């Protein structure tokens, strides 16, 4: 598309105006050689209102410039040529519609302050006696004074000497030295929001760890609490899927979930090739859970019935005691299905070989699934009746 | 009413005192020509206590001024004429009872600091040797010094030279340079609360978008999540009606709801002209929901029964498959009524042609409505039995 | 008690040390006339460890002073007499155990900074060439420089001139100019917590009012929403009783409730003189609710049964229509009792004459009360059977 | 282990580089005697990439130094030797993996600013005319100027005099005087998080106390609310066990609970020596509760059945009236067991002699325990039948 190119070009034109117009207000020797480079940017300003896809555009586009300097209008009225700076109040919002915004906003404030400093320096250069000095060093001194005043440092090596300069510096010391604190506060607060996810996984971890270390916790447990937390930050960046997705409506949430959980989908044998309405009914009820190594899930005799679907990692099935391990299950399989099918207590124990994450599904949705969909229930039936040895 | 006029006049009088009294304390040549303009404001100060609809008013109204300058009381005791400044401590609270308060408060703090600066400058002008200089430039220099000190810039071009001036500037450098930081912090924090609604629709959108862009989401879904969010900001400003209205009591909430949801009311045929107690029983249970274009609502076979009332936009009804579209529904109509009436599963599918918002009503309130109100149930009965083709 | 007197005396002694010890470190001409006033404060320092009802006390109490100046120990080692300042690190915490703490903390930080400024000024006075000047003006100049540096104003009229002074001022410009910002930030944040209740009733009111004024709400409703809110702030200061009292345990909550709701207690005829276990069972289930004038409570035909106990204000009972008003009820009475007793729908309508607040009690606790306590049920029975006309 | 030693050594080497490299950039007379101390640190830099258990390490380890000064490369290109400072951007994160982090982070920011100040001072020393002055005082003056500028104090005693110096000081006054505010804000905010637990027990206590003191609460109740709160802070530091432990998964939560509640375990006679599956089923359902002295728990006639296990303190059993105290129970015992066993109302009253904390267990888990485990039910049966006198 070319809308990005046009927006970048408009930004370039409105920065050209911002840098140029006060500087040519101070020095009238310009605008004679820079004339050909101004008509193009002026006709590229009235051609932006038709490209709607608004009062700033109406006021700023009309060529109020190029005549103020033409008729050589005197000084108390020549300040009305400054209205071509009103594109910024819209550009700062239109540039947002393109990169993390917490980054685009951070930069826009920085340019703004470097434009305000230039404008104030050009203002201070004007109301001075005519001194036979080069223009470049005069601008350097004016900008040095403006940065000294705005930062509330105040060296005092160069200070006002006339009542007009005194009033001007009072106005600056109030206004600019207030917005510098304001903009620096905003930027300082918004730098701390570049991370967002790192901060919460750290606040949560510190909150848990302070309480754990306050008590006389053995080193072993304290080893695992910090390993799980690191695993969660690595694989999920501290995000909470549920907590994010209860802001969206139901169809958008379903569409997002069917792509987010698309890894466990087409992995287990019994989901793919089993219709498209079952896969929509069951996708929202799959919830993630993490079990670390050397940790138990089923303890062979408990109530409840919660099928567990292996996403990543290997799970090991054991008896009610340590003896006679049956087998080992891997990625894309599941276990714990006959607790509700046969109406019997748990008949085996399961551990985790490594950091394996897996999806747990409740009993109510599961027995509703059995009561509604016959052939999937039959497949579970034959798998359970075969799994008897 | 004239209470606004009287309050504005009292504000004008208490600003006249604030600007004048220290300035006439410094210069005793005044108060001779300004006498006729003082008696009116003094008699407009004792006439405010009777207009109650209070200790500041009691202390400040009594003409302690106009005698201090009369008897020409000496300097160490003449400072007791400053008590006419105690109207501000009430005026700053009484002006609130009139425009967003987050705007009225922002301005009141700005005037306060420009009054404190003037008072401090008038103070610094006093304890100086008598210099043969014009009064205007002397006030300008004093105000320049006060603004330099309060802003913590400190050029140092004009500095104290006597022990009394040194003690005065120590007092200012502590006290005023503390409240300047305090007031600027308050104003900086309260500028960010002018928006309120824009901020939350932006924090929520960034929170969702960061997680969406962290994953490998296709561009299509990412297109719709941001279109819905923009539609919600345009039509609701990011507000949450439920979340706002669970602070009010039940009768106030009902009265607010019957005006807020008054658009869907008198629009559908079966609500207006159907009593006034049904319309009170059902107004609180209507909840809004948004469905975007190309999105499904009913999938022809599901459980549940939730009638959907069309507020704005057109909804299209389809079969269990793509073939044989029945008809199209428009603004002010509804669908999905016979799921509970006939005790049958959903017999049709519905999509959205554009961004249509609609109101969903639960099954419990609906069957209670059927069990309580006979004639509305009969109207639904005849509409359902006619809608069989 | 005398513990307050002893604590105030200890504060006076530890402020005497704080003001005196660096000042006598700078000027060795003292400590000769001030000797009798030091032994008393020194023996009032070793007598505080026995009054336990602790390392700061152990280190600071031992008379390390009074010998440093005695043997006239040289300068590089005389700084070890400063350890008598270590009582402050405990006093700042012990003074809390006495007035809103948000006020006591605000003042303690202010004294701390005025002690740090004095200590730094006394430090700067020392490493100077011997100048034949009065001591008072020298201290004034040193304190002026210290306040200029700590506030980050920096006039620059008096500046370091020796390498030792340069190192000292670098140390101050880092350390003191950091804690001044720190302490001022703390004080600025904690000034805004003096109110606490005013802020929340204002944030809530603005949050509701912004949404109400965004919509096209009639002036009448907007009149009542703001009157109720003002009534709630006047009678409850914006507090939420429930929200406060679910931090306490059950017995403390019961003890607090039996005193808070003691106004409605011994007011209605049927509670006082009706045992002490019923009054404990029912005190926690009474909840407050506010109904404004011209507002309805019962609409004659609804389901539910919620007895309403009149706390303050008059309530008016009406028929199902406007005609034939029955009577008027006043403070200390109740209504709406036979909805559950006779198993009949509501037979009357009730309005509010003015801003009357009243207590609502649910149906489950009420019918449990009827099922458990016989004589109160009999009293309700006879009152209901008499109230048939 | 030796990984801590290696990490400390790497920190020492990267601080040696940070202090040395700009200082030898300014003064070329060095690097001749300091050569033997550089080769060791350079070969201790390429030996860190193999010890992985990464682009900063790749760029910084290659000996780009030691040749820039060798060939005596000119000034506009000699600045490329600064790349050996890129270890800090990793070291600041790797030092975290070792002491409360809220302390390690506080210190890392302080070193960073003292390194930035040194770098800026060394920069300012360079672009100066050659003055016949000692190097030490020149560095002292440069560092004094850098600290004056970064702190936004600005004495102005020494100021730039050349255009290059003016551009340099503009760059510093923007950049360094922005990050000084940023880092000081971060450190000021993070100092207030060293406590964490103290703050919440204080915010909660103030929130409760403001409401209690707003009402006309008697002094007696106000005495106990503050004693319980102090007891809770002493024995639990204001922590909420439940609220912390609903962030961990179920097996980690169980493992943590079986160590946290290990005090009440092996204390009561009937838990230890009663299997290992009962002790896992019941450990998560024990919840703590605190009852102060002179407070009632059971009032002899109520419904419900909640066994109470004595952790610490003595509990006293009384009749339905004051007469005929039966006995006294101590640490490690329990009461209130026959409310569900005999299906009878409460037959006794119990008070608290002192601040005794105890564990309450609900009725559903208790009757499930009775229905599942026979021998523990039999032990409760025989204890209840013996406890009949
Ligand atoms: C980045 C760095 C700053 C921007 C780039 C460098 C800016 C230009 C720097 C520059 O050349 O300095 C002077 C500019 O003079 C002139 O009229 C130029 C006057 C305007 C210069 C720019 C002023 C604003 C700088 C705002 C910086 C913001 C940074 C964030 C010229 O003297 P020069 O060095 O030849 O020595 C002369 C003699 O002393 C030794 O031979
Ligand atoms: C807005 C702008 C400031 C307020 C409006 C302008 C204020 C007045 C500005 C003004 O006229 O300046 C001087 C005031 O003198 C006098 O005695 C007047 C002394 C008091 C002036 C006001 C001081 C406080 C300003 C606080 C501003 C806060 C802004 C936020 C007079 O010299 P003038 O220019 O004739 O040149 C003389 C010669 O140098 C060239 O012919
Ligand atoms: C409150 C106000 C400040 C405290 C109270 C007033 C403090 C004392 C004020 C004082 O008397 O000033 C000088 C103190 O001199 C001396 O040696 C005294 C030196 C020490 C004075 C105190 C310094 C610290 C003040 C910290 C204030 C914090 C406020 C928050 C003496 O000159 P004096 O006036 O006779 O004129 C002389 C000539 O110029 C005209 O006859
Ligand atoms: C802690 C304190 C500061 C660090 C420790 C002390 C630092 C060194 C202090 C020092 O000795 O000062 C001068 C350093 O000179 C030199 O070249 C040394 C130049 C560099 C000194 C260090 C500068 C940065 C200090 C950054 C401090 C951050 C604190 C947080 C020497 O003059 P000296 O006293 O012999 O008197 C001479 C005459 O006036 C009287 O006989
Ligand atoms: N021999 C086996 N081979 C494969 N899977 C098994 C075997 N024995 C038990 N399982 C699985 O392990 C599960 C443990 O709990 P369930 O009894 O609910 O259901 C069990 C089966 O899913
Ligand atoms: N031919 C039709 N004309 C109008 N509305 C229909 C038609 N067919 C179905 N509907 C509506 O579409 C709804 C789809 O779900 P229900 O079966 O619950 O109820 C259905 C009717 O409200
Ligand atoms: N004539 C009356 N005198 C006093 N109270 C009444 C009278 N009529 C109705 N009430 C009360 O008003 C209540 C309205 O609702 P209820 O019918 O639940 O119970 C009613 C009584 O408590
Ligand atoms: N004489 C006694 N000796 C020991 N314990 C008792 C005695 N009488 C009552 N209790 C205990 O006190 C409890 C009070 O409530 P319960 O009746 O539920 O169960 C009671 C017993 O656990």
UniProtKB/TrEMBL annotation, chains A, B, C, D:
Keyword Ribosomal protein: no
GO MF, one example: intracellularly cyclic nucleotide-activated monoatomic cation channel activity
Compartments, as annotated in UniProt: Membrane
Cyclic nucleotide-binding domain location: 270-387
InterPro entries assigned to the protein according to its UniProt record, in alphabetical order: CNG_cation_channel, cNMP-bd_CS, cNMP-bd_dom, cNMP-bd_dom_sf, K_chnl_dom, RmlC-like_jellyroll
Binding site for 3',5'-cyclic AMP 1: 336-337, 346-348
Binding site for 3',5'-cyclic AMP 2: 336-337, 346-348, 387
Entry membrane topology: Multi-pass membrane protein
Transmembrane segments: 3-19, 58-86, 102-127, 139-156, 168-192
Gene3D superfamilies tied to this protein: 1.10.287.70, Helix hairpin bin, Jelly Rolls
GO cellular component terms, semicolon-separated: membrane
Protein name (Swiss-Prot/TrEMBL): Transcriptional regulator, Crp/Fnr family
Organism: Winmispira thermophila (strain ATCC 700085 / DSM 6578 / Z-1203)
